[PDB]
Amino acid sequence: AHIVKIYDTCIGCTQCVRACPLDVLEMVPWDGCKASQMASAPRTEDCVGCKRCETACPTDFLSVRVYLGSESTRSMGLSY
Amino acid sequence: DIAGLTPCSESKAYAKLEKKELKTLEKRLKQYEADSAPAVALKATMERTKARFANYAKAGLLCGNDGLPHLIADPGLALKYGHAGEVFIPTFGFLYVAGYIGYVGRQYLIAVKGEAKPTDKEIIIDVPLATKLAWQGAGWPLAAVQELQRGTLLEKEENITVSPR
Amino acid sequence: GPKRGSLVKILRPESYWFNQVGKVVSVDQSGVRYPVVVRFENQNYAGVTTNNYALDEVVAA
Amino acid sequence: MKDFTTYLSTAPVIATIWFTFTAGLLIEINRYFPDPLVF
Amino acid sequence: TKLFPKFSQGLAQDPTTRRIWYGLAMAHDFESHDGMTEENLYQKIFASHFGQLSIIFLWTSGNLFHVAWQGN
Amino acid sequence: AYKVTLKTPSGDKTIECPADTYILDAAEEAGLDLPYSCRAGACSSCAGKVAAGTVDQSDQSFLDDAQMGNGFVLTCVAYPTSDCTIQTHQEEALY
Amino acid sequence: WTVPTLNPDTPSPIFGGSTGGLLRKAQTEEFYVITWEAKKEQIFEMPTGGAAIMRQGPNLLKFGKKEQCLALTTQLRNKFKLTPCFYRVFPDGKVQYLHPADGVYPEKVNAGRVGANQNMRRIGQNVNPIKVKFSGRMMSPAEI
Amino acid sequence: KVKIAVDRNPVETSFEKWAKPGHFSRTLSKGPNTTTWIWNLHADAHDFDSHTSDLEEISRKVFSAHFGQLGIIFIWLSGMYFHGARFSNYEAWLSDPTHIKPSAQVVWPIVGQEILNGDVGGGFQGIQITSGFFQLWRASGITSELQLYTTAIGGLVMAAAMFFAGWFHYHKAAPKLEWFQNVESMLNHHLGGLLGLGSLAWAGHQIHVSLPVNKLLDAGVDPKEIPLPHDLLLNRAIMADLYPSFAKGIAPFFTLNWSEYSDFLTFKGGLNPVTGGLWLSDTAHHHVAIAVLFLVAGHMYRTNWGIGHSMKEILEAHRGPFTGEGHVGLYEILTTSWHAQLAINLALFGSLSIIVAHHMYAMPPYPYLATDYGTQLSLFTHHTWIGGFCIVGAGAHAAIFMVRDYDPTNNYNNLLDRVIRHRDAIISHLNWVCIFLGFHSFGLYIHNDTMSALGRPQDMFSDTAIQLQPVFAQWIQNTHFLAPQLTAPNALAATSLTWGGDLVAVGGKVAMMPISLGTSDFMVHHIHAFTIHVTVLILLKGVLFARSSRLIPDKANLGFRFPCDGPGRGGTCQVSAWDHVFLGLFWMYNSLSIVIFHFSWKMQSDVWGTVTGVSHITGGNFAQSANTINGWLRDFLWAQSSQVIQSYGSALSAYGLIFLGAHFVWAFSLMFLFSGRGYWQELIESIVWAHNKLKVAPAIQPRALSITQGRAVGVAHYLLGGIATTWSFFLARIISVG
Numbered sequence A: 001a002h003i004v005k006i007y008d009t010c011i012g013c014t015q016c017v018r019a020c021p022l023d024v025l026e027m028v029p030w031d032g033c034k035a036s037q038m039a040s041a042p043r044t045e046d047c048v049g050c051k052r053c054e055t056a057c058p059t060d061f062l063s064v065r066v067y068l069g070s071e072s073t074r075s076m077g078l079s080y
Numbered sequence B: 001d002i003a004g005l006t007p008c009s010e011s012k013a014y015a016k017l018e019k020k021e022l023k024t025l026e027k028r029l030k031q032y033e034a035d036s037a038p039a040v041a042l043k044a045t046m047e048r049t050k051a052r053f054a055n056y057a058k059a060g061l062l063c064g065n066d067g068l069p070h071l072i073a074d075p076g077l078a079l080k081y082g083h084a085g086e087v088f089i090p091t092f093g094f095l096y097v098a099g100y101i102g103y104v105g106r107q108y109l110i111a112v113k114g115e116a117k118p119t120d121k122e123i124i125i126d127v128p129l130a131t132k133l134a135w136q137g138a139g140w141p142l143a144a145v146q147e148l149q150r151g152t153l154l155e156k157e158e159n160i161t162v163s164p165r
Numbered sequence C: 001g002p003k004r005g006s007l008v009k010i011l012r013p014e015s016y017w018f019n020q021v022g023k024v025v026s027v028d029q030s031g032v033r034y035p036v037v038v039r040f041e042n043q044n045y046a047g048v049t050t051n052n053y054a055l056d057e058v059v060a061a
Numbered sequence D: 001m002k003d004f005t006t007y008l009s010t011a012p013v014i015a016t017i018w019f020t021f022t023a024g025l026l027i028e029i030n031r032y033f034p035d036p037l038v039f
Numbered sequence E: 001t002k003l004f005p006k007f008s009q010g011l012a013q014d015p016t017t018r019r020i021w022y023g024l025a026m027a028h029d030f031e032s033h034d035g036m037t038e039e040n041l042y043q044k045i046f047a048s049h050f051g052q053l054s055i056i057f058l059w060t061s062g063n064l065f066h067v068a069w070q071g072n
Numbered sequence F: 001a002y003k004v005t006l007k008t009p010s011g012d013k014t015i016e017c018p019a020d021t022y023i024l025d026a027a028e029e030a031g032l033d034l035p036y037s038c039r040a041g042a043c044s045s046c047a048g049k050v051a052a053g054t055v056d057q058s059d060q061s062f063l064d065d066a067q068m069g070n071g072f073v074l075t076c077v078a079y080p081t082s083d084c085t086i087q088t089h090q091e092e093a094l095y
Numbered sequence G: 001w002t003v004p005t006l007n008p009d010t011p012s013p014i015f016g017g018s019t020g021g022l023l024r025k026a027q028t029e030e031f032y033v034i035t036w037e038a039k040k041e042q043i044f045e046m047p048t049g050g051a052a053i054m055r056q057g058p059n060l061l062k063f064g065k066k067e068q069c070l071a072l073t074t075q076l077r078n079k080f081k082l083t084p085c086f087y088r089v090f091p092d093g094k095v096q097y098l099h100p101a102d103g104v105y106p107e108k109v110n111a112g113r114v115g116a117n118q119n120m121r122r123i124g125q126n127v128n129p130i131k132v133k134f135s136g137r138m139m140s141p142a143e144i
Numbered sequence H: 001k002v003k004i005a006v007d008r009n010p011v012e013t014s015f016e017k018w019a020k021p022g023h024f025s026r027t028l029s030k031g032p033n034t035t036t037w038i039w040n041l042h043a044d045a046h047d048f049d050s051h052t053s054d055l056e057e058i059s060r061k062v063f064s065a066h067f068g069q070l071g072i073i074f075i076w077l078s079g080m081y082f083h084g085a086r087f088s089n090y091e092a093w094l095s096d097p098t099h100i101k102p103s104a105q106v107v108w109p110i111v112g113q114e115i116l117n118g119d120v121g122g123g124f125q126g127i128q129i130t131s132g133f134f135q136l137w138r139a140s141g142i143t144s145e146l147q148l149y150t151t152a153i154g155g156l157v158m159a160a161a162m163f164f165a166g167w168f169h170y171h172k173a174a175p176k177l178e179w180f181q182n183v184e185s186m187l188n189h190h191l192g193g194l195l196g197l198g199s200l201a202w203a204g205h206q207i208h209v210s211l212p213v214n215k216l217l218d219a220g221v222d223p224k225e226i227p228l229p230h231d232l233l234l235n236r237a238i239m240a241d242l243y244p245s246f247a248k249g250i251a252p253f254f255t256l257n258w259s260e261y262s263d264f265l266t267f268k269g270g271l272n273p274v275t276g277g278l279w280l281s282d283t284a285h286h287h288v289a290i291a292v293l294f295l296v297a298g299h300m301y302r303t304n305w306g307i308g309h310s311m312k313e314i315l316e317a318h319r320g321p322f323t324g325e326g327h328v329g330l331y332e333i334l335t336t337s338w339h340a341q342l343a344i345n346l347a348l349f350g351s352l353s354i355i356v357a358h359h360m361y362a363m364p365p366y367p368y369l370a371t372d373y374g375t376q377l378s379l380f381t382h383h384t385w386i387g388g389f390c391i392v393g394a395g396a397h398a399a400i401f402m403v404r405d406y407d408p409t410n411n412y413n414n415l416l417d418r419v420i421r422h423r424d425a426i427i428s429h430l431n432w433v434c435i436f437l438g439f440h441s442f443g444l445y446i447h448n449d450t451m452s453a454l455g456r457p458q459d460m461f462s463d464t465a466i467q468l469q470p471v472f473a474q475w476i477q478n479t480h481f482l483a484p485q486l487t488a489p490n491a492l493a494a495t496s497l498t499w500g501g502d503l504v505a506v507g508g509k510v511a512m513m514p515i516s517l518g519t520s521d522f523m524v525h526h527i528h529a530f531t532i533h534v535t536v537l538i539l540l541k542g543v544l545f546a547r548s549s550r551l552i553p554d555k556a557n558l559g560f561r562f563p564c565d566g567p568g569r570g571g572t573c574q575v576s577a578w579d580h581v582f583l584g585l586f587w588m589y590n591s592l593s594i595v596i597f598h599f600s601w602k603m604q605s606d607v608w609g610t611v612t613g614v615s616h617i618t619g620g621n622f623a624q625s626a627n628t629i630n631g632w633l634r635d636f637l638w639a640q641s642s643q644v645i646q647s648y649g650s651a652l653s654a655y656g657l658i659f660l661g662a663h664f665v666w667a668f669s670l671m672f673l674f675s676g677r678g679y680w681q682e683l684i685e686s687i688v689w690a691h692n693k694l695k696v697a698p699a700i701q702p703r704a705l706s707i708t709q710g711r712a713v714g715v716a717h718y719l720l721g722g723i724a725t726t727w728s729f730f731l732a733r734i735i736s737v738g
C-alpha cells in the first residue's frame, strides 16, 4: 500500500481531491489556512499512486506527497 | 633533428609522395585535350600541389619517414628551433578572437539583462547596440583585467544553491 | 511586517526562489502561519510566480 | 513597412543572415587565398 | 502467501512473480532484510566471504584436475 | 482607474481599481475582506461573477470558457479593463 | 441523511453487451455495482468502451474495479448532474455500496469529517532516514 | 443545389502577426518563458484543429496549404529542368545512351570537392544522376536543351501562379463550407476531367510528338536531324509516311474502322529489343484506354439534375444480416473529419507507390532504362520507402481522428461499433498468427545455418536440401506464360519475360530474363509476410485502444500524444497511440530494409550482369547462400562491401564518407533512445548554476525536452542514419559494379 501525506501548506483548493481518480482524498474543516479546509486521505489503500493529486496541488512543495508502498490487487489496478 | 625527425625539405619520402601525386595527376590528365576545361583544371591542380609542397619545404617542417609534417609542442623547443609559426601564433590568434567573442557576448548579455523585457531582447536584438559593442570589444582583454583588479568580474556567493549544497 | 510591493530575498530552502529575491504583494494581519505574499518574475518548474511565506523565510532585500 | 522591419529583427532570421555573412566571408577567403597551413 | 523471500515477507506477499524477481534482487541486501541486527549481519557477510573463498578454491582445483586429466 | 462595483453579501461597495492591480488586491487595500486561498488563479475560492464591464484574467487556470462567458472571474488574478460590476462570494454558484 | 441499500432488481440501462466485461475476479474476490436514477432516457458512453442508453430513473450497472465506477460517476455528475451511489460487493453477497458513500460528496467541506494521515506540520521538517534505520521493515522518514 | 459559395476579403494582409510568434494559437501567443515554448510553437504551427474550431476556416487553411505545396513542387521540378538544361551532357547521351553516364550536377573548383566531377563520358565532368531524367526525356523525345530551358522557365511561372492562388483564396476570397462539402460534384469533376483529360492529352502528345521522334531515334537518325515537333504537326505528309493511316486523317475513326489505325495502336507486349523500352504504340494504346475509362467514369453521381446517384443512399442500402446497421452514417462521418479522408488517401497512396515501383522494374518503359541497373534499384527503393511512410502516416492520422472527432452518439450499431466490441478477440488472433509466422519463418534460416555449422547440410532447407517450392508462384508464372495462346488470342508477347521465355539484350547488359523461384525465395516471401503482419498488429492495437483500454478506461481524455500517466499501478510508460505509431515506424523500417535486401541480391545474382552466357554479377550465389544467414552476411554484405570500403581517392569517395557519417548519426540517435529527461534537467540545473555563477543565465528558462519530443528526435535520427548508410552502400556498389 502506497503512502500519502498532507502538510500545513494545504490551501485546501481541493485540486488534489479534485484530481484523485480513486477518491482516496477528501476535504475536512480546518483552521490553518484561509480556506479553513484541510485535505485528507482516509482511503489510502485504494490509491494506486497515480499522483494526479501531487500534480494538482499548487502548493510550493506539494501540500500532499505520495509514497508508493507494497502491492495489492487494488494497488495494481488489476480488474482480473 | 628533434626526436630524430628530419625535415621533409630534406626527407626523401616527401618528394617521393609529391611526385607520386603528380603522377596520378598526369594519369587522370592524359585522357583529354589540352584546352579542355578538365585538362586545364588538372594542370592548375598540379600547380597548386607543387606550390603547396614548395611552401611546406620552405617552412622548414620536420617530416619523418612518411615524409609527412609532424608538429612540435613545447614553447622552448619551438622557439629554440624556429617552430613557433606552427603552434604558438595560431593558438594566440585563436585565444584572442575567442576571448573577444565571449567578452562581447557577455557585454550584450549584461546590457540586455539591464532591461525590462529580458525575453524579448533575447529573441529580438538591438542591432545598433550590438554593432557598438562589436566595435568596442577589441579592448576586451584590458577591460577584463581591469575588472579583475577591481574584482568586478565574478558573481558573489548569492547564486541559487542546491539544498545539500 | 514588510510593505506591499517591497522587495524581499527568499530564504525558505525548499522554495524554487530560494536564495533569490521576490516582491511582497502583501502580508496578512490574521493568524496565518505564512502571511507574506511575494510575487516572482521567473516561474518555477510548476510555472507559478508567487508563493506564501512566513515572516522569517523572507528578508527585506 | 515597420511590421516588415520587426519581422526582420525577429531572431532566427538574424541568426540566418549573420551566419550567411560569416560563411561567405570565409569561403571568399579560401577562394582568393587557397591552401592555408601556417602563420 | 509463499515463504517467497523469508528475509522479506513484504515481498513474499506479492501475488505476482515480481515477488520472485525482487526476492532474488534483494537476497543479499541484508541491511534491508527484516529484523536484521548488526552482529548478525556481520556474521552473515562472514559466511558469505567463506563461501566466496570456497568458490575460488573449487575453481582452481577443477582447472588443475582437468588439465592433469586431459591436457598436453 | 476603473470603478468596480462589488455586489457583496454586505451590500454594494464601489471601489477604484487601477488597470495594473488585481480586483482582489484593490478590494483588500480598500479595507474589504473577500474570500481567497491560493491567490494564484488555480482554485475557486475568490470567484465572482461579472454582471457588466470587462476584466482581463488571462493568467487564470481554473475556469473554462463557458464559465468565463457567463461572467465568472477569479478575482485574485483579474485586472479590470473597464468600469465593471462584480457579484462577490460566487464560489457556490459556480458549483 | 442515511446510508442507502442496494436493490439487485434494477432495470440495467440499454447496452448491446461488450467484450470488455467482467472476469473471474468478480466471481472470486469482489465486484462493484453502481446505482443512480436518471431524469430521462438517454444514450451514454461505456467507460469500458461502448455506447449505452440509460433508462428513466432506476438504472444499475456492475463492475469489478473502482476506477470504472469512479470515472462513470465523473461522466454523469458533470454531464447530467446525477448523484449516483455505488457499492462494494463480494461473492459472499455482502454489499458496501461505497465508493464516495459519505452523506454528500467529498469535494466540499463537511462537519464530522475527521482529518486522517495529515502531518500537522511542513514537509521539510522530516528527519534523515539514518534514524529510521534498523526498524522492523523498510519505513520512510515521512512515515513519522 | 451545387454552386459556388465564397466569402470576399475574409483575411487581411499585413506583416503585423509576422512580428508576433504564436499568434495562431492561444497559449503560445503569450510568448516564451522556458525553452519548450519554441518547440511547441513549431510543433503546432500546422495543427489547424488546434488553431480553432471553424471547419470552414480550417478547410481554407488546408486549401492554401495545398496551394503552397504544389508551388514548392513546381519550384523543384523547374530547378531540376534548369540544371538539366545548363549543367548536363544530355545531348551527348542522346547521341550515345549506350556509353555515356547521365550526369547533371557539377561542383566548384574548391578545396577538393572538385575530384568528384568524374568522367561519365562525352568529355563531361560531374556526377552520375540515378534519376533517369535522360531516359525520361528521350522517351518524351526532348532533343534540344533549349527545350528544358523553356520547361524550367514555365515551371517557375506555374509556381508563382500557385502561390498567388493560395494567397488570393485565403485572404481575398475563401469558399464556404457547403461549397467544400459538394462532394459528389467534386468526385465527378475529378474522376472524369482530371484523369481522363490528362491521360488523353498525354496520349495525344505521345502520338503526335514522341512516337514519331522516338521512332526516328530508334531508326538511328541523328538527334539534331529530326524535324521539329510543330513542323510535324503541320505536315501530315511525314505522319502518313511513318504510318499511312494518317493519310486518311480522322474520318476512319469517324467510321469506326479502328483496325486501320493499328499501325500505332498495337498489342505487341514486351519491350522494343533494340531499346529495352516498352512498345510506344502499346503505351499510347494503354494511355488512351485509361483516358476513355476515366472519362466515362466521371459521370456517376447527381449534382444538379435528377440523374446521378447518392453515395449516402447506396451506402445505407448496403447492409447485411450479421452486421446490423451496415454502412449507415459513414456518410456523415466522412463529411466531417479531415483526418479520416487524410488517413484513407495516405494508405491508398503508399500502396500505390509500392505497386508503381513493382510494375516499373517489372516492365521498364524507358529507352535503355533496364541497362541502368543503378537507376532501376534507386527509384525502386525510393518509391518503396515513400509508400511505407505514407502507410504509417495513414495509421497516424486515423488514430488522430479516432481520438478527436469520434462520437458514439451517431454510430449506434455499425461496423465500427461491433469492431469496438470484439476488438479483443480480433487482436488476440492477430497476436497468435504473427507469433507463429515469426517462429517458423525465422527458425527456418536458423536451422539451416545450424546444420551448416554442424556439418549436416543434408538436413538444411535448401533447394537441394529439404525443399519448399513455391509451386503456386511457379504454376502461375507458367500460367501467364501460356495465357496469350487462348486467354489472350490477340496477344503477341507476354507482358513480362519473367513469365518465361527468352532473354533480351541491349548493349551486352542483361535487360530482362525469366526469373525462377526457389525455396530460398519461398522463405524470403514468408519473412516479408510475417514482418508486415507485425507492423499491422502494432498499428491496429494503437488505433483500437487509442480511446480506452481495460487498463485505461479514460484514455480518450489524455489527448492523442501524451507521455504517460505516471509510474503508478506498475507504470504507465509509453501508452499513447502516438507511441504505437512510433513503434510501427521501427518495425516498418525493419521490414522494408529486409525487402530491399532481397530485391538487390536476387537481381544481382539471377537477373543482372552482362550477356556474351549470362555473366551474372554475383553468379547466382544467392540461390545457395540465401538459405543460410552466414551466406547472407558474407556473400552479400561482406562481398559487396569492397566497392564502398575502397572508394577513396575516387569521385565516389563521398559514398564511403557518408557511409561512415550515417553510421555516426545513427549511433548518435541512441543517446536519445535510451536517456531520461529527468536526468537531463538535473544536468541543466547543474550547468545553469555554472552559468549564473558568472551572471550568464539566459532569460528563457532552459528545459529538458518532453518525453515525447525526446522519443521523436531519437527515432528521426535513427531512421536517418540507417537509411543513409544503406543508401550510400547501394549507390557506391552499383556504380562500381554495374
Ligand code: CLA
Pocket: B073, B074, B075, B076, B077, B078, B080
Ligand atoms: C604542458 C606542459 C609542458 C610540458 C610537458 C613541457 C615539456 C617541455 N618543456 Mg616546457 N613549457 C611549457 C609547457 C610544457 N613544457 C609552457 C606552457 C611553457 C611556457 C612558459 C614552457 C616553456 C618552456 C621552455 C622555455 C623550455 C621548455 C622546455 C621543455 C622541454 C624540456 C624541459 C622539460 O622537461 O620541461 C618540463 C615541462 C614543464 C615543467 C611544464 C611547465 C613549463 C614551465 C612554465 C616552464 C618550463 C621551462 C623548462 C623547465 C626549461 C628547461 C630548459 C632545459 C634546457 C634545461 C620539454 C619538451 C625546454 C626545451 O625546449 O627543452 C628542449 C625549454 O627550454 N618549456
Ligand SMILES: CC1=C(C/C=C(\C)CCC[C@H](C)CCC[C@H](C)CCCC(C)C)C(=O)c2ccccc2C1=O
Pocket: D015, H671, H672, H675, H676, H677, H680, H681, H703, H704, H705, H706, H707, H709, H710, H711
Ligand atoms: C541530450 C538530451 C537532452 C539535453 C538536450 C537538449 C534539451 C537539446 C538542446 C538543443 C539546443 C542545443 C539548445 C538551444 C540553443 C539555442 C537556440 C541558443 C542559441 C544557440 C546558437 C548556436 C544558435 C534532453 O533534454 C533530452 C530529453 C529527453 C530525452 C533525451 C534527451 C537528450 O538526449
Ligand code: SF4
Pocket: A004, A016, A019, A020, A021, A022, A023, A024, A025, A046, A047, A048, A049, A050, A051, A052, A053, A054, A066, H568
Ligand atoms: S496518488 Fe493517485 S489515487 Fe492517490 S491521490 Fe494521487 S492521483 Fe489520487
Ligand code: SF4
Pocket: A009, A010, A011, A012, A013, A014, A015, A016, A017, A038, A039, A056, A057, A058, A059, A062, A063, A064
Ligand atoms: S493538496 Fe493542494 S490542491 Fe489539494 S487541498 Fe491541499 S492545497 Fe488544495
Ligand code: FES
Pocket: A013, F035, F036, F037, F038, F039, F040, F041, F042, F043, F044, F045, F046, F047, F062, F074, F075, F076, F077
Ligand atoms: S484564490 Fe485561488 S484562484 Fe483566486
